[PDB]
């Protein structure tokens, strides 16, 4: 609704699904742009979360920055799989490398979701202390 964190989390899952059915339609050189996208919508998410942090229990902020760091890591793994899919286009490891790329992005989305729950849940434990 008026929840930005929710929205960017949805923008980012959208970006992950596009990527899914558009390696099929893209050449190796283009895989850079798509991930660049997923990266950018992610920065927007991680940014609008970074904005909330101040107003809530530190006990949350630990585990929240946990899933944030987790996402950065998730991106990195996606980027690496993408690099591997470029280099390995035109070799027998082409498909597997792409398969890996999808999985990297998949769990990227999943962890984006878990970021949201951690936020929703921390938003609550905040409201009731107050």
């Amino acid at each position: 609704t008026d929840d930005l964190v929710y929205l960017n989390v949805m923008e980012l899952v959208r970006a992950v699904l596009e990527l899914k059915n558009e390696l099929s339609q893209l050449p190796p050189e283009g895989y850079v742009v798509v991930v660049k996208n997923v990266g950018l919508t992610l920065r927007k998410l991680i940014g609008s979360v970074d904005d909330l942090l101040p107003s809530l229990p530190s006990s949350s902020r630990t585990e929240i920055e946990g899933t944030q760091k987790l996402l950065n890591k998730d991106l990195a793994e996606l980027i690496n799989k993408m690099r591997l899919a470029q280099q390995n286009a035109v070799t027998s490891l082409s498909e597997e490398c792409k398969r890996q790329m999808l999985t990297a992005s998949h769990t990227l989305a999943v962890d984006a979701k878990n970021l949201l729950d951690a936020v929703d849940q921390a938003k609550v434990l905040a409201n009731l202390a107050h």
Partner: peptide, 13 residues
């Protein structure tokens, strides 16, 4: 903070 290690992650692209 978080954005920072990300923008860095981003540059490598």
């Amino acid at each position: 903070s978080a954005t920072r290690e990300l923008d860095e992650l981003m540059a490598s692209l």
